[PDB]
């Protein structure tokens, strides 16, 4: 089994920039490496085959090269259509294995998030379950750390996170961490907070409520 | 002018056998290989197997051995892929891929649109709508709905700007929750109505909840 | 095994001298054959001539146990596995009337176990006939008449001939229906329509680099019972010459190819080739410092005879190779097409003997 390692997992770049994405094989795969492009909710599209050969109808900006057991896909001048996820695939021996993937994002200016805390509805509070939502509005980059603190005690394994796709207008991200507890544990504790660690913030911003 | 048309999306219990078809047109069916590649939600690609219609026998991945069966009807010009002993881990988009080169099964130029196979375990429950009361932010929490998708709106198409609807997150309980948020002026707070329109067609549920500061 | 490595090593060095002369031409050589014949000639030589041969070969035949291992190698390389696939012969022609050294003939038969052939060179046409008849009767008429025998004179006293024919049965034959005509890219850029056979199988395949840093691939093709095998080596890029691979050839590198191999699924398109090559061994051996052998008075053959000033009047090797579908489904992700000049090596795997090797510039 040949393991396909892709570096980086996430890549941020501007339009007209040179983009280099790396692929690595656990053992020698000759020149038998294919490169695919995938857009959200769309089927993968082959760009490069035989490490450097260009597929039919694929533009010149796409390049491929081999450095031993490492293969690099190069975009000379990044275009608006090029912001997608890229997968490398080997065709030396079976099973046919694909890489982890490298998403190419729009490089923006560092935007600090707007933190908002929402308590659960009294409706809900009553139906036996309590959902505490922490909202991070319009930020850059995607890298953010959200910590749940119930009466200054850090929480683990009881919350779920959700990230939106990079915006069409301002190219920012939005995050929502939802803490879920039983109504009976909600009611024993008082202070509920979500500590946010982000590049845009010089100090971790904590938004709290008493209930 | 090569096209790969696949069968409609399927939702099955963790029994179970799912069979996806792939109609190929137009080119020589017998000589060229048709493979099956799957993609889990928010995950990479995975090859299951392939078939050269003239060979009769298909190539498989040792990981799926004893589950998969890949067949191709030369007269119908359709390739098939059935997966037995289904479970929550099989929840993925199934792609039909075709080789540009004759007699080989390596890299694929032609790809089908994809067939979503959801593996649950879940009843077909409606969504429980809850509000998130308060430049100011206010939301709408959609809970325990099945199956996906759910289209959500604010003020009946009235608001597009500053509204974020997060993707569905699947819970331990086998069911989904969604959140929707909106960034509005605080001045406007408590003076303008805001209503979140939740539409869940599979169970036919339409809820319009009002969010006010309380 | 150790003698089999030394013998092949010397033979690949002689081949390189033959290949560097031709360069753009088709060549088929027998590294074992040239080693086997020169190991026999070591017994006829003495003084400066003997030490020239011994130094270039890397071994002394009179050393123990060089000859018993060399005999055991022929018995091994020969029979009963080879279904008249391979036919070999070694012959040292000497003057009939020439007084041989007392105790040379029993010593030569003790070590090989054959004899030096005695013919009368004054009867020129009969002498040429017996040399060509020996080649024909021992190689089953598969090898065509010698052209080098035109150098046979009345003054001729010592002639060396080595003839080999090989057409081996594949372990997995190529289907006849799969044989199609395809373009072959010659070194000068030009293309020719040649018949090429094809098969999808699990091949022993490896990749190596040249000093200049270029990739070359080696594919292993086994013959029935895994006794014999054929290696096909060629650079990946067509802009890279086959000489870059030939200039770096050695018996140790061929073993490294085998050691670094991995069984991989591939579709192999390989052309059909039939080569016949008659080599005058004078220049390739003289280039390897064995100059005395062919010099009028300088040549020391005192161990064979001291009655007349002796020297090699002719030293030849005629080899004929046939590569077809057979001497007498499968899934693959990538195909290998041999549509550019390539190097071939016929190896006897249990000992690592390089029986045959050459360059196919135009099939």
Author numbering:
A (entry chain I): 1 to 211
B (entry chain E): 1 to 134, 143 to 222
C (entry chain A): 6 to 333, 345 to 379
What does the paper say about this structure?
The major physiological role of PAI-1 is to block the conversion of plasminogen to plasmin by tissue-type plasminogen activator (tPA) and urokinase-type plasminogen activator (uPA). PAI-1 is synthesised in the active conformation, which is characterised by the accessibility of its reactive centre loop (RCL) to protease binding. Interaction of this bait region with the active site of either tPA or uPA in a 1:1 stoichiometric complex results in cleavage of the P1-P1′ bond and extensive structural re-arrangement, characterised by the insertion of the N-terminal portion of the RCL into β-sheet A and the complete translocation of the protease to the opposite pole of the PAI-1 molecule. Here we describe the in vitro and in vivo characterisation of neutralising anti-PAI-1 antibody MEDI-579 and the crystal structure of MEDI-579 Fab in complex with human PAI-1.
The crystal structure of the complex between PAI-1 and MEDI-579 Fab was determined by molecular replacement and refined to an R-factor of 22% and an Rfree of 24%. The asymmetric unit is composed of four PAI-1:Fab complexes, denoted AIE, BJF, CKG and DLH for PAI-1 and the light and heavy chains of the Fab, respectively. With the exception of the RCL, the conformation of PAI-1, including within the reported vitronectin binding site, is unaltered by its interaction with MEDI-579 Fab with an RMSD of 1 Å when compared to uncomplexed native PAI-1 (3q0338). MEDI-579 Fab binds to the ‘top’ of PAI-1 directly engaging the RCL, including the scissile P1-P1′ residues, and an exosite immediately adjacent to the RCL. The interface buries a total of 1745 Å2, with the majority (60.5%) involving the light chain of the Fab. Interactions with the RCL, from P2 to P3′, accounts for 35% of the total buried surface area, with almost all of the contacts (91%) involving the Fab heavy chain. The interaction between the heavy chain of the Fab and the RCL of PAI-1 is sufficient to explain both the ability of MEDI-579 to inhibit PAI-1-protease interactions and the lack of binding to latent PAI-1. However, for the two main targets of PAI-1, uPA and tPA, a conserved exosite adjacent to the RCL is also used for recognition. Both uPA and tPA place an Arg residue (Arg37A - chymotrypsin numbering) onto a negatively-charge surface on β-sheet C of PAI-1 to make a salt-bridge with Glu212. The MEDI-579 Fab similarly contacts this site using VL chain residues His31 and Arg66. Therefore, MEDI-579 inhibits PAI-1 by blocking both the RCL and the exosite region necessary for recognition of its two targets uPA and tPA.
